[PDB]
Design a protein around this ligand. Structure first.
Ligand code: ASP
Length: 299
């Protein structure tokens, strides 16, 4: 192992934030894996369809999952998300931690986060919020945003924030929370309005955006960690090979440069099964409590 290419499933549309991470990582893992990694995009239901696909795939090491913190929210959002977060997989390791930006279409009237809150409260019924479906990173942040503002908004789900971004750029949807691996490009060129970040400290590549925390939203912190998993029952030597390849992929300079430019923190020393298992163990109950408090129930 591996004696043929390894398929890496990204549960979202090509060209978006997780796809960007996946394609860079696929390249960086190659020298150590000793085979090419082929990215497959499988969007739908906030990432649960793609996650489920890998959960049900042959445990031979030729199907692996690259998925983000939505892996941990979906079990509190769906009566049956299609997988069991603690047992459906053999965890390989953590990958990156990506902050989010609150953005709007380029001609959205407010120019800052204070004015945004005021505008959304006053004009709520005229405003659409985009996300990548229940279970997505943009869904989690969007939920937190409308809760913090005390509003209910028309909410439009997409198979990823790549198609959502298309509509935002096209002025077909108004407001979105999305990861810097997808938004940096559009923010720095001035193509979208940018209001705030969801990190505890400012994003150094986007230094003029205040955190939500410093903007008055105490504890409004969202970091979209990403993990890599194989299906339950994948042989230990195969998991071992995947761990070694992931570690080498994260330690690679080209990968790290691209991640740095996109505002992603590389979790270089946390690319091991135990770290990912611990992350999932902590995160599922954390988001469960958040949704419970927001009155957001399983469906
Ligand atoms: N990470 C997703 C977007 C999201 O979950 O909000 C994507 O790659 O499209």
């Amino acid at each position: 192992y591996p004696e043929r290419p390894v398929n890496m499933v990204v549960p979202f549309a090509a060209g978006g934030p997780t796809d960007n991470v996946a394609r860079s990582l696929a390249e960086s893992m190659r020298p150590t894996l000793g085979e090419t990694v082929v990215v497959e995009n499988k969007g739908g239901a906030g990432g649960t369809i793609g996650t489920t696909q890998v959960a049900r795939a042959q445990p031979d090491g030729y199907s692996i999952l690259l998925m983000h913190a939505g892996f941990s929210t979906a079990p509190s959002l769906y009566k049956n998300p299609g997988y069991e977060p603690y047992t459906s997989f053999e965890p390989i390791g953590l990958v990156v931690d990506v902050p989010m930006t609150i953005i709007a279409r380029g001609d959205f009237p407010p120019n800052n986060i204070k004015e945004l809150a005021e505008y959304v409260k006053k004009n709520a019924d005229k405003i659409s919020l985009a996300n990548a479906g229940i279970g997505a990173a943009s869904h989690l942040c969007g939920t937190m945003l409308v809760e913090a503002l005390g509003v209910n908004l028309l909410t439009i789900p997409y198979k990823g924030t790549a198609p959502a971004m298309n509509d935002l750029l096209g002025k077909q949807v108004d407001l979105m929370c999305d990861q810097t691996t997808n938004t940096t490009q559009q923010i720095t060129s001035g193509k979208v309005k940018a209001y705030a970040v969801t990190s505890l400290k400012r994003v150094p590549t986007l230094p003029d955006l205040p955190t939500m925390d410093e903007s008055g939203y105490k504890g409004f912190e969202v970091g979209i960690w990403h993990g890599m998993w194989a299906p339950k029952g994948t042989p230990k030597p195969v998991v071992d090979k995947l761990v070694k390849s992931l570690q080498a992929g994260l330690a690679d300079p080209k990968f790290q440069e691209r991640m740095k430019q996109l505002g992603a923190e590389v979790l270089t020393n946390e690319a091991n099964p135990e770290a990912l298992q611990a992350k999932v163990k902590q995160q599922v109950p954390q988001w469960a409590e958040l949704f419970k408090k927001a009155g957001v129930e399983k469906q």
